[PDB]
Amino acid sequence: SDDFLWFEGIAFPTMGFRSETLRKVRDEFVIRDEDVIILTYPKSGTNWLAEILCLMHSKGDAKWIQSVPIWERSPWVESEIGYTALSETESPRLFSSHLPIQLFPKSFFSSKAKVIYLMRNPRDVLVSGYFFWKNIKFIKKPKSWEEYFEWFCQGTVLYGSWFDHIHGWMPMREEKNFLLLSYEELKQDTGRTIEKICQFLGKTLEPEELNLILKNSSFQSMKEYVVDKTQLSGDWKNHFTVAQAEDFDKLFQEKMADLPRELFPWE
Numbered sequence: 001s002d003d004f005l006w007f008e009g010i011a012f013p014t015m016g017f018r019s020e021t022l023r024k025v026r027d028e029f030v031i032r033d034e035d036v037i038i039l040t041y042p043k044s045g046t047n048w049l050a051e052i053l054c055l056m057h058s059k060g061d062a063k064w065i066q067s068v069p070i071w072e073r074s075p076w077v078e079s080e081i082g083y084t085a086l087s088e089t090e091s092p093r094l095f096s097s098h099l100p101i102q103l104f105p106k107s108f109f110s111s112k113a114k115v116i117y118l119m120r121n122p123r124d125v126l127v128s129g130y131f132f133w134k135n136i137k138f139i140k141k142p143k144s145w146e147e148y149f150e151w152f153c154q155g156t157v158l159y160g161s162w163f164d165h166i167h168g169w170m171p172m173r174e175e176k177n178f179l180l181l182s183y184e185e186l187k188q189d190t191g192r193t194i195e196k197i198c199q200f201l202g203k204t205l206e207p208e209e210l211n212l213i214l215k216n217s218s219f220q221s222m223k224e225y226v227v228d229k230t231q232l233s234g235d236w237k238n239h240f241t242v243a244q245a246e247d248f249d250k251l252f253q254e255k256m257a258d259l260p261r262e263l264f265p266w267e
Ligand SMILES: C[C@]12CC[C@H](O)C[C@@H]1CC[C@@H]1[C@@H]2CC[C@]2(C)C(=O)CC[C@@H]12
Pocket: 013, 015, 016, 042, 043, 046, 071, 076, 079, 080, 081, 082, 098
């Protein structure tokens, strides 16, 4: 009764996943140079980014996108339902993945498949994870906020350390098939970000298609198994005590020292 799937030093949700699949993801899954993958540490804005991409493909028409659910528009390759769908989908394929770099498909590293990595202020990530995860059945829950705070800081949470996750993927930030984005810039100005994604993917849009896309992909438009139905707010400053914040800056400072500080927009 540990309440999670432990695999290669990383904890995964009990339901929906299996070791044998995780093993195949890294050893067998074949990636195509035409595939596009959304890479994120859980709760960093994957859905929003999935929306933008789906809208870009549908030229703004929020038709299909409306009916089709998240895990179907950009399924998670590491999940059962995910691995299966991707295994029988015809390129071009759009899929998501929270996997740290050392467990990602081997085939990827010799391909031209394009990857978009989205990162977010870890403070917001920790809060969203707290409220999201503590509201999901069968997965180990924290006895309290203070406790979850400690797990996140020590890496003992689903998908592992946020710090490790960023360190492992950052070394590719300059590859031509790797686009690095921040949730912060995504929110500050979707237009600018959409333009980067178009440039990175080599897509072009008619002024009127962009118009529609910009409208269906604004933060407001985004505002759209489970314990309590309710929670399905504020900011990290409404949860972190001043002491937790001072302790987190310190930890962040120590942990990210070997990486350019200006790589991270937030304070
Ligand atoms: C938990 C999560 C991956 C961690 C995410 O940021 C929160 C996501 C909720 C939907 C889950 C997904 C894992 C794979 C699942 C189980 C599927 O294949 C369909 C429902 C999917």
